[PDB]
Amino acid sequence: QNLADPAYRRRRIIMQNMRDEELAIAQVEEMQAVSAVLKGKYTMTGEAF
Amino acid sequence: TTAQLLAANEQKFKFDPLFLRLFFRESYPFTTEKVYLSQIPGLVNMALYVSPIVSGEVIRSRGGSTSEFTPGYVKPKHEVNPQMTLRRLPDEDPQNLADPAYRRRRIIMQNMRDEELAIAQVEEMQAVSAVLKGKYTMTGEAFDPVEVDMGRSEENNITQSGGTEWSKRDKSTYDPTDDIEAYALNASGVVNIIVFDPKGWALFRSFKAVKEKLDTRRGSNSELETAVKDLGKAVSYKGMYGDVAIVVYSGQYVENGVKKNFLPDNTMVLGNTQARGLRTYGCIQDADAQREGINASARYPKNWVTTGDPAREFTMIQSAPLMLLADPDEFVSVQLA
Amino acid sequence: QNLADPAYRRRRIIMQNMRDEELAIAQVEEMQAVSAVLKGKYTMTGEAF
């Protein structure tokens, strides 16, 4: 009961999307930091990098 | 050689949304995947005699039925490119003339007019087809077929056959009015209007008995206009015949290059002028529109520039219409062959 | 949307039940009267009576 119009579903989808990218970036930053501290060196490698 | 373009007319086909104005009002736009329609039988059995000893046969409480539909979609488009704008237009004098930019604004408009006319034609075709027969099918080349079906009883859709046809029977000494009553007995609710395809009207008024019903001092109150009344208009409201009004509708929808008539060659449609019709418009599906914040609107317009080799900016109207009938059995369609 | 509680459903069901049997009795009465007017005599038989 008490549904919402699609113009609001689109906005909620957008907000959770952008939260997901922010969390992914923070996760990569922490994985970079820990390897920077735990060991003297680290490598940034990707399939298209 | 010099010249002037003194006059320049435009040719149009006789088009007027009659059935959509008369029988379909109260437009309801919906932001939902599918709509519902429901109905309750309302048939009560006769109270059969029961002895004051037996006391049995509890009677089942009546329950209804439902139906769900899915709206169709439609989106025509037009284009403009700088190849069109430079040569000339058939509507401007060799004198005067304008920069290749006025020409782009004029061309851009007439496209809007054509898009609106196409969408209106589709709406009217759905509206008319919903009345003649209970169901109508929406189809295309890129559209998966969807078949809307409102339950109309088999006792409607009366089609004349080897017996009881007006053409074969004598045109003198016959009362058309007797059949009309028998056909209209099958409807549910009062009937207040009759729609004739012009061939059907010519067939109907040819009877001498109907002529006699006009010139009777006290035998009727019917007043028609048998002589020619309208010869170019799409609709011709003729006088009330008895109680019901009489209407002749000759509209034209063009599919492919050839013109075609809406009503299928002399059908007659009994019906009620206050019949409950629904005008449902679905939800448009365009990420730009939903970003803008719009939904469940008719005729969402847009344009965009595609930065191609010849440039080009298009234009698009999209509506997604669906025409329904709350009570499909309030009309009685007659072939009248 | 905005569905109601079953007690209201029971109330409207019982009301339409009563309307149904009232109209059934009315139908029997009218058939009785019509048969009386049209023909002099009628049989008033049935399946239990």
PDB file of N, CA, C and O in Angstrom, chain B residues 190-255:
ATOM      1  N   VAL B 190     -30.758   2.170 -21.127  1.00  0.00           N
ATOM      2  CA  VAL B 190     -31.484   2.890 -22.165  1.00  0.00           C
ATOM      3  C   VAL B 190     -30.541   3.250 -23.308  1.00  0.00           C
ATOM      4  O   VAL B 190     -29.320   3.350 -23.134  1.00  0.00           O
ATOM      5  N   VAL B 191     -31.111   3.444 -24.497  1.00  0.00           N
ATOM      6  CA  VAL B 191     -30.357   3.817 -25.688  1.00  0.00           C
ATOM      7  C   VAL B 191     -30.839   5.179 -26.167  1.00  0.00           C
ATOM      8  O   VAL B 191     -32.046   5.436 -26.234  1.00  0.00           O
ATOM      9  N   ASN B 192     -29.888   6.058 -26.492  1.00  0.00           N
ATOM     10  CA  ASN B 192     -30.191   7.452 -26.771  1.00  0.00           C
ATOM     11  C   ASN B 192     -29.543   8.008 -28.030  1.00  0.00           C
ATOM     12  O   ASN B 192     -29.601   9.224 -28.237  1.00  0.00           O
ATOM     13  N   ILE B 193     -28.922   7.179 -28.867  1.00  0.00           N
ATOM     14  CA  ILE B 193     -28.287   7.673 -30.082  1.00  0.00           C
ATOM     15  C   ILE B 193     -28.064   6.495 -31.014  1.00  0.00           C
ATOM     16  O   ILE B 193     -27.900   5.357 -30.571  1.00  0.00           O
ATOM     17  N   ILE B 194     -28.076   6.770 -32.316  1.00  0.00           N
ATOM     18  CA  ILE B 194     -27.812   5.780 -33.351  1.00  0.00           C
ATOM     19  C   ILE B 194     -26.804   6.369 -34.323  1.00  0.00           C
ATOM     20  O   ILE B 194     -26.958   7.515 -34.757  1.00  0.00           O
ATOM     21  N   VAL B 195     -25.780   5.594 -34.667  1.00  0.00           N
ATOM     22  CA  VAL B 195     -24.723   6.039 -35.569  1.00  0.00           C
ATOM     23  C   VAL B 195     -24.814   5.238 -36.858  1.00  0.00           C
ATOM     24  O   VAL B 195     -24.754   4.004 -36.835  1.00  0.00           O
ATOM     25  N   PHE B 196     -24.941   5.939 -37.981  1.00  0.00           N
ATOM     26  CA  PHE B 196     -25.061   5.322 -39.293  1.00  0.00           C
ATOM     27  C   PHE B 196     -23.829   5.592 -40.142  1.00  0.00           C
ATOM     28  O   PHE B 196     -23.347   6.727 -40.217  1.00  0.00           O
ATOM     29  N   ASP B 197     -23.327   4.546 -40.772  1.00  0.00           N
ATOM     30  CA  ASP B 197     -22.438   4.714 -41.905  1.00  0.00           C
ATOM     31  C   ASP B 197     -23.274   5.193 -43.093  1.00  0.00           C
ATOM     32  O   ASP B 197     -24.346   4.640 -43.345  1.00  0.00           O
ATOM     33  N   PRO B 198     -22.834   6.231 -43.819  1.00  0.00           N
ATOM     34  CA  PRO B 198     -23.728   6.856 -44.814  1.00  0.00           C
ATOM     35  C   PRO B 198     -24.416   5.900 -45.778  1.00  0.00           C
ATOM     36  O   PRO B 198     -25.577   6.145 -46.133  1.00  0.00           O
ATOM     37  N   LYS B 199     -23.759   4.825 -46.214  1.00  0.00           N
ATOM     38  CA  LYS B 199     -24.464   3.838 -47.026  1.00  0.00           C
ATOM     39  C   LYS B 199     -25.622   3.222 -46.252  1.00  0.00           C
ATOM     40  O   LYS B 199     -26.716   3.027 -46.800  1.00  0.00           O
ATOM     41  N   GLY B 200     -25.408   2.926 -44.971  1.00  0.00           N
ATOM     42  CA  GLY B 200     -26.495   2.425 -44.149  1.00  0.00           C
ATOM     43  C   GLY B 200     -27.627   3.423 -44.004  1.00  0.00           C
ATOM     44  O   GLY B 200     -28.798   3.047 -44.001  1.00  0.00           O
ATOM     45  N   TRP B 201     -27.294   4.708 -43.874  1.00  0.00           N
ATOM     46  CA  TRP B 201     -28.334   5.729 -43.773  1.00  0.00           C
ATOM     47  C   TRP B 201     -29.150   5.815 -45.056  1.00  0.00           C
ATOM     48  O   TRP B 201     -30.383   5.915 -45.010  1.00  0.00           O
ATOM     49  N   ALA B 202     -28.477   5.779 -46.207  1.00  0.00           N
ATOM     50  CA  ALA B 202     -29.196   5.788 -47.475  1.00  0.00           C
ATOM     51  C   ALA B 202     -30.092   4.566 -47.598  1.00  0.00           C
ATOM     52  O   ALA B 202     -31.211   4.658 -48.113  1.00  0.00           O
ATOM     53  N   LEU B 203     -29.615   3.412 -47.132  1.00  0.00           N
ATOM     54  CA  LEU B 203     -30.450   2.215 -47.141  1.00  0.00           C
ATOM     55  C   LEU B 203     -31.661   2.374 -46.228  1.00  0.00           C
ATOM     56  O   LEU B 203     -32.769   1.951 -46.574  1.00  0.00           O
ATOM     57  N   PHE B 204     -31.463   2.977 -45.055  1.00  0.00           N
ATOM     58  CA  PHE B 204     -32.523   3.037 -44.053  1.00  0.00           C
ATOM     59  C   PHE B 204     -33.617   4.019 -44.447  1.00  0.00           C
ATOM     60  O   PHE B 204     -34.808   3.707 -44.333  1.00  0.00           O
ATOM     61  N   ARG B 205     -33.245   5.210 -44.908  1.00  0.00           N
ATOM     62  CA  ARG B 205     -34.270   6.202 -45.211  1.00  0.00           C
ATOM     63  C   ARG B 205     -35.029   5.899 -46.495  1.00  0.00           C
ATOM     64  O   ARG B 205     -35.997   6.601 -46.797  1.00  0.00           O
ATOM     65  N   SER B 206     -34.617   4.883 -47.255  1.00  0.00           N
ATOM     66  CA  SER B 206     -35.319   4.549 -48.487  1.00  0.00           C
ATOM     67  C   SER B 206     -36.669   3.893 -48.234  1.00  0.00           C
ATOM     68  O   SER B 206     -37.457   3.756 -49.173  1.00  0.00           O
ATOM     69  N   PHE B 207     -36.948   3.474 -47.005  1.00  0.00           N
ATOM     70  CA  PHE B 207     -38.217   2.821 -46.718  1.00  0.00           C
ATOM     71  C   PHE B 207     -39.352   3.832 -46.725  1.00  0.00           C
ATOM     72  O   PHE B 207     -39.220   4.942 -46.205  1.00  0.00           O
ATOM     73  N   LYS B 208     -40.478   3.441 -47.321  1.00  0.00           N
ATOM     74  CA  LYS B 208     -41.624   4.340 -47.389  1.00  0.00           C
ATOM     75  C   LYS B 208     -42.343   4.443 -46.049  1.00  0.00           C
ATOM     76  O   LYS B 208     -42.972   5.469 -45.768  1.00  0.00           O
ATOM     77  N   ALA B 209     -42.276   3.399 -45.218  1.00  0.00           N
ATOM     78  CA  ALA B 209     -42.920   3.458 -43.910  1.00  0.00           C
ATOM     79  C   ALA B 209     -42.273   4.514 -43.024  1.00  0.00           C
ATOM     80  O   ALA B 209     -42.970   5.250 -42.315  1.00  0.00           O
ATOM     81  N   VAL B 210     -40.942   4.607 -43.052  1.00  0.00           N
ATOM     82  CA  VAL B 210     -40.266   5.649 -42.289  1.00  0.00           C
ATOM     83  C   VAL B 210     -40.635   7.024 -42.826  1.00  0.00           C
ATOM     84  O   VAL B 210     -40.750   7.987 -42.060  1.00  0.00           O
ATOM     85  N   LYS B 211     -40.834   7.141 -44.139  1.00  0.00           N
ATOM     86  CA  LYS B 211     -41.346   8.387 -44.697  1.00  0.00           C
ATOM     87  C   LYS B 211     -42.724   8.706 -44.137  1.00  0.00           C
ATOM     88  O   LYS B 211     -43.023   9.864 -43.823  1.00  0.00           O
ATOM     89  N   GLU B 212     -43.581   7.690 -44.008  1.00  0.00           N
ATOM     90  CA  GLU B 212     -44.912   7.908 -43.451  1.00  0.00           C
ATOM     91  C   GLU B 212     -44.848   8.327 -41.990  1.00  0.00           C
ATOM     92  O   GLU B 212     -45.691   9.105 -41.532  1.00  0.00           O
ATOM     93  N   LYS B 213     -43.862   7.829 -41.241  1.00  0.00           N
ATOM     94  CA  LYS B 213     -43.739   8.233 -39.845  1.00  0.00           C
ATOM     95  C   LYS B 213     -43.411   9.711 -39.690  1.00  0.00           C
ATOM     96  O   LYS B 213     -43.566  10.253 -38.592  1.00  0.00           O
ATOM     97  N   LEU B 214     -42.957  10.375 -40.754  1.00  0.00           N
ATOM     98  CA  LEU B 214     -42.589  11.780 -40.637  1.00  0.00           C
ATOM     99  C   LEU B 214     -43.794  12.700 -40.776  1.00  0.00           C
ATOM    100  O   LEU B 214     -43.936  13.654 -40.005  1.00  0.00           O
ATOM    101  N   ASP B 215     -44.672  12.431 -41.740  1.00  0.00           N
ATOM    102  CA  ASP B 215     -45.769  13.336 -42.083  1.00  0.00           C
ATOM    103  C   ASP B 215     -47.096  12.908 -41.467  1.00  0.00           C
ATOM    104  O   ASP B 215     -48.151  13.064 -42.085  1.00  0.00           O
ATOM    105  N   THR B 216     -47.077  12.368 -40.253  1.00  0.00           N
ATOM    106  CA  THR B 216     -48.295  12.014 -39.541  1.00  0.00           C
ATOM    107  C   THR B 216     -48.618  13.113 -38.537  1.00  0.00           C
ATOM    108  O   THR B 216     -47.728  13.588 -37.824  1.00  0.00           O
ATOM    109  N   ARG B 217     -49.887  13.526 -38.497  1.00  0.00           N
ATOM    110  CA  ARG B 217     -50.274  14.665 -37.670  1.00  0.00           C
ATOM    111  C   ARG B 217     -50.116  14.368 -36.185  1.00  0.00           C
ATOM    112  O   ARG B 217     -49.631  15.214 -35.426  1.00  0.00           O
ATOM    113  N   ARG B 218     -50.525  13.178 -35.751  1.00  0.00           N
ATOM    114  CA  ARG B 218     -50.488  12.828 -34.341  1.00  0.00           C
ATOM    115  C   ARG B 218     -49.838  11.481 -34.066  1.00  0.00           C
ATOM    116  O   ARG B 218     -49.748  11.086 -32.900  1.00  0.00           O
ATOM    117  N   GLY B 219     -49.388  10.771 -35.092  1.00  0.00           N
ATOM    118  CA  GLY B 219     -48.829   9.452 -34.919  1.00  0.00           C
ATOM    119  C   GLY B 219     -47.376   9.390 -34.518  1.00  0.00           C
ATOM    120  O   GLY B 219     -46.875   8.294 -34.258  1.00  0.00           O
ATOM    121  N   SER B 220     -46.679  10.520 -34.454  1.00  0.00           N
ATOM    122  CA  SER B 220     -45.278  10.524 -34.055  1.00  0.00           C
ATOM    123  C   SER B 220     -44.849  11.956 -33.775  1.00  0.00           C
ATOM    124  O   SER B 220     -45.550  12.915 -34.107  1.00  0.00           O
ATOM    125  N   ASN B 221     -43.680  12.084 -33.153  1.00  0.00           N
ATOM    126  CA  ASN B 221     -43.025  13.370 -32.957  1.00  0.00           C
ATOM    127  C   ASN B 221     -41.657  13.413 -33.619  1.00  0.00           C
ATOM    128  O   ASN B 221     -40.861  14.309 -33.319  1.00  0.00           O
ATOM    129  N   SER B 222     -41.362  12.465 -34.502  1.00  0.00           N
ATOM    130  CA  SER B 222     -40.055  12.385 -35.130  1.00  0.00           C
ATOM    131  C   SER B 222     -39.906  13.453 -36.201  1.00  0.00           C
ATOM    132  O   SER B 222     -40.818  13.683 -36.999  1.00  0.00           O
ATOM    133  N   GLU B 223     -38.746  14.099 -36.223  1.00  0.00           N
ATOM    134  CA  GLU B 223     -38.422  15.076 -37.253  1.00  0.00           C
ATOM    135  C   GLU B 223     -37.018  14.788 -37.752  1.00  0.00           C
ATOM    136  O   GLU B 223     -36.058  14.869 -36.982  1.00  0.00           O
ATOM    137  N   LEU B 224     -36.904  14.434 -39.021  1.00  0.00           N
ATOM    138  CA  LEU B 224     -35.629  14.183 -39.670  1.00  0.00           C
ATOM    139  C   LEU B 224     -35.369  15.275 -40.698  1.00  0.00           C
ATOM    140  O   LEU B 224     -36.162  16.203 -40.867  1.00  0.00           O
ATOM    141  N   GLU B 225     -34.238  15.161 -41.390  1.00  0.00           N
ATOM    142  CA  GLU B 225     -33.943  15.996 -42.553  1.00  0.00           C
ATOM    143  C   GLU B 225     -33.548  15.040 -43.670  1.00  0.00           C
ATOM    144  O   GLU B 225     -32.366  14.773 -43.891  1.00  0.00           O
ATOM    145  N   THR B 226     -34.560  14.531 -44.372  1.00  0.00           N
ATOM    146  CA  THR B 226     -34.332  13.522 -45.397  1.00  0.00           C
ATOM    147  C   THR B 226     -33.479  14.070 -46.533  1.00  0.00           C
ATOM    148  O   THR B 226     -32.607  13.370 -47.059  1.00  0.00           O
ATOM    149  N   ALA B 227     -33.705  15.325 -46.916  1.00  0.00           N
ATOM    150  CA  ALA B 227     -32.953  15.946 -47.997  1.00  0.00           C
ATOM    151  C   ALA B 227     -31.482  16.084 -47.631  1.00  0.00           C
ATOM    152  O   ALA B 227     -31.085  15.765 -46.507  1.00  0.00           O
ATOM    153  N   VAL B 228     -30.664  16.557 -48.570  1.00  0.00           N
ATOM    154  CA  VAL B 228     -29.234  16.680 -48.322  1.00  0.00           C
ATOM    155  C   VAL B 228     -28.991  17.750 -47.269  1.00  0.00           C
ATOM    156  O   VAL B 228     -29.516  18.865 -47.364  1.00  0.00           O
ATOM    157  N   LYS B 229     -28.206  17.412 -46.246  1.00  0.00           N
ATOM    158  CA  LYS B 229     -27.879  18.357 -45.189  1.00  0.00           C
ATOM    159  C   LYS B 229     -26.400  18.718 -45.170  1.00  0.00           C
ATOM    160  O   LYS B 229     -26.046  19.893 -45.295  1.00  0.00           O
ATOM    161  N   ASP B 230     -25.522  17.735 -45.020  1.00  0.00           N
ATOM    162  CA  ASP B 230     -24.088  17.971 -44.981  1.00  0.00           C
ATOM    163  C   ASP B 230     -23.430  17.076 -46.015  1.00  0.00           C
ATOM    164  O   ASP B 230     -23.718  15.878 -46.072  1.00  0.00           O
ATOM    165  N   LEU B 231     -22.561  17.655 -46.836  1.00  0.00           N
ATOM    166  CA  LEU B 231     -21.908  16.900 -47.892  1.00  0.00           C
ATOM    167  C   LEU B 231     -20.391  16.993 -47.849  1.00  0.00           C
ATOM    168  O   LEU B 231     -19.724  16.350 -48.669  1.00  0.00           O
ATOM    169  N   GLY B 232     -19.824  17.767 -46.931  1.00  0.00           N
ATOM    170  CA  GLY B 232     -18.385  17.808 -46.775  1.00  0.00           C
ATOM    171  C   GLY B 232     -17.936  17.494 -45.364  1.00  0.00           C
ATOM    172  O   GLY B 232     -16.809  17.037 -45.148  1.00  0.00           O
ATOM    173  N   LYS B 233     -18.812  17.730 -44.394  1.00  0.00           N
ATOM    174  CA  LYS B 233     -18.452  17.550 -42.998  1.00  0.00           C
ATOM    175  C   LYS B 233     -18.358  16.068 -42.648  1.00  0.00           C
ATOM    176  O   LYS B 233     -18.951  15.205 -43.301  1.00  0.00           O
ATOM    177  N   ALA B 234     -17.590  15.780 -41.596  1.00  0.00           N
ATOM    178  CA  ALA B 234     -17.407  14.403 -41.155  1.00  0.00           C
ATOM    179  C   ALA B 234     -18.622  13.865 -40.411  1.00  0.00           C
ATOM    180  O   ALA B 234     -18.929  12.675 -40.521  1.00  0.00           O
ATOM    181  N   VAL B 235     -19.317  14.713 -39.657  1.00  0.00           N
ATOM    182  CA  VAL B 235     -20.480  14.309 -38.881  1.00  0.00           C
ATOM    183  C   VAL B 235     -21.669  15.159 -39.313  1.00  0.00           C
ATOM    184  O   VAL B 235     -21.524  16.317 -39.708  1.00  0.00           O
ATOM    185  N   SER B 236     -22.860  14.564 -39.245  1.00  0.00           N
ATOM    186  CA  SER B 236     -24.080  15.284 -39.622  1.00  0.00           C
ATOM    187  C   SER B 236     -25.176  14.895 -38.630  1.00  0.00           C
ATOM    188  O   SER B 236     -25.832  13.863 -38.782  1.00  0.00           O
ATOM    189  N   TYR B 237     -25.369  15.738 -37.622  1.00  0.00           N
ATOM    190  CA  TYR B 237     -26.402  15.516 -36.614  1.00  0.00           C
ATOM    191  C   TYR B 237     -27.763  15.734 -37.251  1.00  0.00           C
ATOM    192  O   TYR B 237     -28.185  16.871 -37.469  1.00  0.00           O
ATOM    193  N   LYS B 238     -28.457  14.647 -37.564  1.00  0.00           N
ATOM    194  CA  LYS B 238     -29.806  14.761 -38.089  1.00  0.00           C
ATOM    195  C   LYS B 238     -30.798  14.788 -36.930  1.00  0.00           C
ATOM    196  O   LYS B 238     -30.452  14.526 -35.775  1.00  0.00           O
ATOM    197  N   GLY B 239     -32.048  15.121 -37.233  1.00  0.00           N
ATOM    198  CA  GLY B 239     -33.025  15.322 -36.185  1.00  0.00           C
ATOM    199  C   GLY B 239     -33.348  14.047 -35.431  1.00  0.00           C
ATOM    200  O   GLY B 239     -33.078  12.935 -35.878  1.00  0.00           O
ATOM    201  N   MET B 240     -33.930  14.224 -34.249  1.00  0.00           N
ATOM    202  CA  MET B 240     -34.298  13.079 -33.428  1.00  0.00           C
ATOM    203  C   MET B 240     -35.439  12.310 -34.075  1.00  0.00           C
ATOM    204  O   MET B 240     -36.457  12.892 -34.459  1.00  0.00           O
ATOM    205  N   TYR B 241     -35.262  11.000 -34.198  1.00  0.00           N
ATOM    206  CA  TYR B 241     -36.264  10.095 -34.744  1.00  0.00           C
ATOM    207  C   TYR B 241     -36.935   9.376 -33.585  1.00  0.00           C
ATOM    208  O   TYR B 241     -36.375   8.422 -33.038  1.00  0.00           O
ATOM    209  N   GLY B 242     -38.127   9.829 -33.215  1.00  0.00           N
ATOM    210  CA  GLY B 242     -38.740   9.290 -32.017  1.00  0.00           C
ATOM    211  C   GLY B 242     -38.025   9.791 -30.781  1.00  0.00           C
ATOM    212  O   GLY B 242     -38.041  10.984 -30.461  1.00  0.00           O
ATOM    213  N   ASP B 243     -37.393   8.864 -30.060  1.00  0.00           N
ATOM    214  CA  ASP B 243     -36.624   9.249 -28.883  1.00  0.00           C
ATOM    215  C   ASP B 243     -35.148   9.412 -29.237  1.00  0.00           C
ATOM    216  O   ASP B 243     -34.538  10.441 -28.924  1.00  0.00           O
ATOM    217  N   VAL B 244     -34.564   8.416 -29.904  1.00  0.00           N
ATOM    218  CA  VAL B 244     -33.129   8.415 -30.161  1.00  0.00           C
ATOM    219  C   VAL B 244     -32.779   9.451 -31.219  1.00  0.00           C
ATOM    220  O   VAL B 244     -33.592   9.775 -32.093  1.00  0.00           O
ATOM    221  N   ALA B 245     -31.567   9.988 -31.133  1.00  0.00           N
ATOM    222  CA  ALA B 245     -31.040  10.846 -32.181  1.00  0.00           C
ATOM    223  C   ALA B 245     -30.425  10.001 -33.293  1.00  0.00           C
ATOM    224  O   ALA B 245     -30.152   8.812 -33.125  1.00  0.00           O
ATOM    225  N   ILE B 246     -30.207  10.628 -34.443  1.00  0.00           N
ATOM    226  CA  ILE B 246     -29.668   9.952 -35.616  1.00  0.00           C
ATOM    227  C   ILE B 246     -28.406  10.674 -36.059  1.00  0.00           C
ATOM    228  O   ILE B 246     -28.421  11.894 -36.257  1.00  0.00           O
ATOM    229  N   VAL B 247     -27.321   9.923 -36.225  1.00  0.00           N
ATOM    230  CA  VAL B 247     -26.014  10.475 -36.555  1.00  0.00           C
ATOM    231  C   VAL B 247     -25.432   9.693 -37.722  1.00  0.00           C
ATOM    232  O   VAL B 247     -25.520   8.461 -37.761  1.00  0.00           O
ATOM    233  N   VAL B 248     -24.846  10.407 -38.679  1.00  0.00           N
ATOM    234  CA  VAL B 248     -24.103   9.801 -39.777  1.00  0.00           C
ATOM    235  C   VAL B 248     -22.658  10.252 -39.661  1.00  0.00           C
ATOM    236  O   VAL B 248     -22.373  11.454 -39.721  1.00  0.00           O
ATOM    237  N   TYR B 249     -21.749   9.296 -39.502  1.00  0.00           N
ATOM    238  CA  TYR B 249     -20.334   9.579 -39.312  1.00  0.00           C
ATOM    239  C   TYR B 249     -19.554   8.969 -40.463  1.00  0.00           C
ATOM    240  O   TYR B 249     -19.643   7.762 -40.704  1.00  0.00           O
ATOM    241  N   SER B 250     -18.797   9.802 -41.174  1.00  0.00           N
ATOM    242  CA  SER B 250     -17.919   9.352 -42.252  1.00  0.00           C
ATOM    243  C   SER B 250     -16.559   9.996 -42.012  1.00  0.00           C
ATOM    244  O   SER B 250     -16.257  11.055 -42.564  1.00  0.00           O
ATOM    245  N   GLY B 251     -15.746   9.355 -41.181  1.00  0.00           N
ATOM    246  CA  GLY B 251     -14.410   9.836 -40.906  1.00  0.00           C
ATOM    247  C   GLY B 251     -13.393   9.076 -41.722  1.00  0.00           C
ATOM    248  O   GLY B 251     -13.711   8.019 -42.272  1.00  0.00           O
ATOM    249  N   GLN B 252     -12.172   9.591 -41.818  1.00  0.00           N
ATOM    250  CA  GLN B 252     -11.157   8.980 -42.662  1.00  0.00           C
ATOM    251  C   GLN B 252      -9.837   8.901 -41.918  1.00  0.00           C
ATOM    252  O   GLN B 252      -9.307   9.923 -41.476  1.00  0.00           O
ATOM    253  N   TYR B 253      -9.315   7.689 -41.785  1.00  0.00           N
ATOM    254  CA  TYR B 253      -7.971   7.440 -41.292  1.00  0.00           C
ATOM    255  C   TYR B 253      -7.156   6.857 -42.433  1.00  0.00           C
ATOM    256  O   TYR B 253      -7.643   5.996 -43.173  1.00  0.00           O
ATOM    257  N   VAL B 254      -5.927   7.331 -42.598  1.00  0.00           N
ATOM    258  CA  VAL B 254      -5.088   6.919 -43.713  1.00  0.00           C
ATOM    259  C   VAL B 254      -3.992   6.005 -43.187  1.00  0.00           C
ATOM    260  O   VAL B 254      -3.136   6.424 -42.400  1.00  0.00           O
ATOM    261  N   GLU B 255      -4.035   4.746 -43.603  1.00  0.00           N
ATOM    262  CA  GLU B 255      -2.962   3.796 -43.356  1.00  0.00           C
ATOM    263  C   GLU B 255      -2.346   3.480 -44.707  1.00  0.00           C
ATOM    264  O   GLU B 255      -3.063   3.088 -45.635  1.00  0.00           O
TER     265      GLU B 255
END
